[PDB]
């Protein structure tokens, strides 16, 4: 381990952050050491920020221009100047705290210059501020109220619902209420959004919404708009898949089978149309090694930043330097970027550690590692998940110390490929014994077995139905896990194919119901 003095000489990065966090959790950062430390932190969010703030609370920020505005309370705000009154009324909780006579007075003060404030003040003088704001068709007010409280729910007419998509809050609003199955009046109302007024993710979610109300024609129209507007081919393919499932136009299935993106939808379409499996690149560098230390986390952070900021030309230089057996994961990572994500790279590094597992297990391990880390041994996530299999420290220590009793175990052993694959096998055994399906195992790997069990206990998830199991896959309630499962399933299919242990993705889908 490294002293705070030595860390401070490294460039700011997630690896430096991780090692500062390890000092904080072992109580090795003094109040004096902590003085300058926020300037040494690459991403000052979450656990590292809350640990540091136990040592030095952070005061700010109040823009000094408005400091005086924050000396007033709900009881004294009528004594404040007009600028101070309007600043404090940015807060809906502040508005809710006012007495209703003061809301009446302030609404009159601001009716000319700030009718938005007037609307919210008079809204909070009623028993349902949302109904008042909806009657005014005040769109900014609507989103402010929603952000204040998710509990408001009302029917919204055609005119009002068609205005909502123009506001930056709409995409997260629509996603949250559709996935969480909340706010049913809002959800039903969003059936009347004209597809011409939405695009991309929002259009897609509105398609999903329409399916849940069995409005399949409206669903098709939303999904078609999504397919036409999505920036990523993978997302476009997901929308085309729905267009096909709903209306069964054989041109849509044909377009999906010919996609340049390898994903579950394009793989499925290929299978349904007797189209050959996509071409997988074969990387076999002849050079054995270079000078690069694959076990130095700081060196990875530095080379990653260079690779990500490399122009078309500097990528070619790096490709050559890292075209060795020892740096195969870095080589594939460079090629993936250098080829503009058009070629399919499915490497199997450190294969000696898994070659004695059965091939189905190999493929699941490789599928997870590909998505988690792209096989970078010293990978570190924003939540300080570690190594190729991206173990959280807590689980790493549970397995390495309590279960396996590895002598002198430290969570940094997760950066060793032999350890990553061994622990990954261990945990995947636990999960698969309970969940069976590789998709369910992927959800549980990323999101936990508790979330996965609760999802599978519901009457409306992964049961029989017209559009199952695809619909359920769109309604997995955590976005990171929803995405993750689809990517890991595609990888699994590919690696099973590469290992001469092919399975039809249609058999995976049947086993989800």
Ligand X SMILES: CC(=O)N[C@H]1[C@H](OC[C@@H]2COCCO2)O[C@H](CO)[C@@H](O)[C@@H]1O
Question: Which of these segments, 48-56, 122-130, 285-293, 367-375, binds ligand X (CB under 6 A)?
Answer: 367-375
378 part of the interface to ligand X, by CB under 6 A: no
Peptide bond into 61 cis (omega under 30): yes
**Where does residue 455 rank: exposed (0-12), middle (13-18), buried (19+ CB within 10 A)?**
buried
CA atoms within 13 A on the CB side of 13: 19
Q: Provide the minimum distance between the beta carbon of 125 and ligand X in the complex, in angstroms, as a whole number.
A: 46
446 part of the interface to ligand X, by CB under 6 A: yes
Cβ(208)–Cβ(238) below 8 Å: no
Cβ(41)–Cβ(48) below 8 Å: yes
Total of residues contacting ligand X (CB under 6 A): 11
Residue nearest to ligand X (CB): 381
243 part of the interface to ligand X, by CB under 6 A: no
Rounded CA gap, 24 and 180, in Å?
36
138 part of the interface to ligand X, by CB under 6 A: no
Q: Spell out the SS3 assignment of 235-261.
A: HHHHHHHHHHHHHCCHHHHHHHHCCCC
379 part of the interface to ligand X, by CB under 6 A: yes
480 part of the interface to ligand X, by CB under 6 A: yes
Question: Which of these segments, 126-134, 305-313, 344-352, 372-380, binds ligand X (CB under 6 A)?
Answer: 372-380
Select from 90, 249, 258, 381 the one that contacts ligand X (CB under 6 A).
381
Question: Which of these segments, 144-152, 294-302, 378-386, 500-508, binds ligand X (CB under 6 A)?
Answer: 378-386
Select from 123, 240, 385, 508 the one that contacts ligand X (CB under 6 A).
385
Phi-psi domain of 510 (left: phi exceeds 0; alpha: psi -120 through 50; beta: other):
alpha
Q: Is residue 505 classed as helix, strand or coil in its secondary structure?
A: helix
Where would I find the H helices in 279-387?
A: 297-308, 312-321, 328-338, 359-373
415 part of the interface to ligand X, by CB under 6 A: no
Q: Provide the minimum distance between the beta carbon of 386 and ligand X in the complex, in angstroms, as a whole number.
A: 9
Rounded CA gap, 489 and 194, in Å?
34
Rounded CA gap, 352 and 396, in Å?
22
492 part of the interface to ligand X, by CB under 6 A: no
Q: Provide the minimum distance between the beta carbon of 382 and ligand X in the complex, in angstroms, as a whole number.
A: 6
Rounded CA gap, 292 and 410, in Å?
23
374 part of the interface to ligand X, by CB under 6 A: yes
Question: Which of these segments, 216-224, 282-290, 368-376, 429-437, binds ligand X (CB under 6 A)?
Answer: 368-376
Select from 390, 411, 437, 472 the one that contacts ligand X (CB under 6 A).
390
The residues that touch ligand X, with contacts defined as CB under 6 A, are: 371-374, 379, 381, 385, 390, 446, 480, 484
């Amino acid at each position: 381990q490294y002293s705070i003095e030595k860390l401070k000489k490294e460039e700011n990065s997630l690896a430096k952050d991780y090692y500062i966090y390890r000092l904080l959790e072992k109580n090795k950062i003094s109040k004096k050491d902590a003085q300058d430390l926020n300037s040494h932190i690459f991403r000052y969010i979450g656990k590292i920020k809350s640990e540091l703030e136990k040592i030095i609370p952070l005061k700010p920020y109040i823009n000094p221009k408005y400091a005086k505005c924050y000396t007033y309370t709900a009881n004294t705000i009528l004594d404040a100047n007009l600028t101070c009154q309007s600043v404090r009324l940015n807060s809906l909780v502040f508005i809710a705290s006012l007495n209703s006579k003061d809301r009446t007075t302030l609404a009159q003060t601001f009716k000319n210059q700030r009718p938005d404030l007037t609307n919210l003040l008079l809204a909070f003088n009623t028993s349902d501020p949302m109904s008042y704001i909806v009657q005014k068709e005040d769109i900014n007010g609507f989103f402010k109220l929603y952000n204040y409280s998710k509990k408001y729910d009302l029917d919204l007419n055609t005119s009002l619902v068609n205005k909502l998509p123009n506001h930056i809050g709409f995409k997260d609003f629509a996603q949250n209420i559709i996935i969480k199955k909340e706010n049913p009046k809002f959800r039903h109302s969003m059936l009347e959004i004209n597809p011409e007024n939405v695009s991309e993710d929002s259009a897609f979610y509105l398609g999903v919404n329409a399916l849940t109300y069995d409005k399949t024609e409206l669903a098709y129209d939303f999904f078609k708009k999504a397919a036409q507007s999505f920036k990523s081919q993978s997302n476009k393919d997901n929308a085309i898949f729905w267009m096909w499932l709903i209306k069964n136009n054989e041109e849509d299935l044909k377009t999906l089978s010919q996609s340049s993106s390898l994903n579950i939808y394009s793989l499925y379409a290929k299978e349904l149309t007797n189209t050959p499996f996509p071409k997988i690149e074969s990387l076999n560098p002849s050079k054995k090694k270079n000078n690069f230390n694959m076990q130095d986390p700081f060196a990875w952070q530095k080379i990653n930043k260079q690779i990500r900021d490399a122009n078309a030309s500097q990528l070619d230089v790096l490709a050559k330097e890292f075209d060795t057996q020892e740096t195969l994961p870095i080589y594939a990572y460079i090629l993936e970027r250098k080829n503009n994500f058009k070629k399919h790279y499915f490497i199997m590094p450190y294969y000696d550690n898994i070659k004695d597992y059965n091939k189905t297990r190999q493929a699941l391990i490789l599928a997870i590692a590909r998505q988690e880390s792209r096989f970078i041994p010293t990978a570190i996530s924003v939540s300080y998940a570690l190594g190729m299999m991206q173990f959280m420290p807590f689980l790493a220590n549970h397995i390495g110390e309590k279960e396996l009793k590895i002598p002198n175990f430290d969570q940094d052993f997760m950066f060793k490929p032999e350890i990553a694959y061994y622990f990954g096998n261990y945990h995947l055994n636990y999960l698969e014994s309970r969940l069976k399906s590789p998709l369910f195992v992927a959800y549980a790997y990323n999101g936990g077995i508790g979330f996965t069990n609760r999802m599978l206990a519901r009457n409306d998830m992964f049961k029989t139905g017209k559009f199952e199991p695809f619909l359920s896959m769109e309604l997995v309630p955590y976005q990171e896990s929803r995405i993750y499962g689809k990517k890991v399933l595609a990888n699994y299919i590919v690696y099973r194919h590469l290992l001469n242990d092919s399975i039809k993705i249609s058999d995976i889908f049947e086993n989800l119901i």
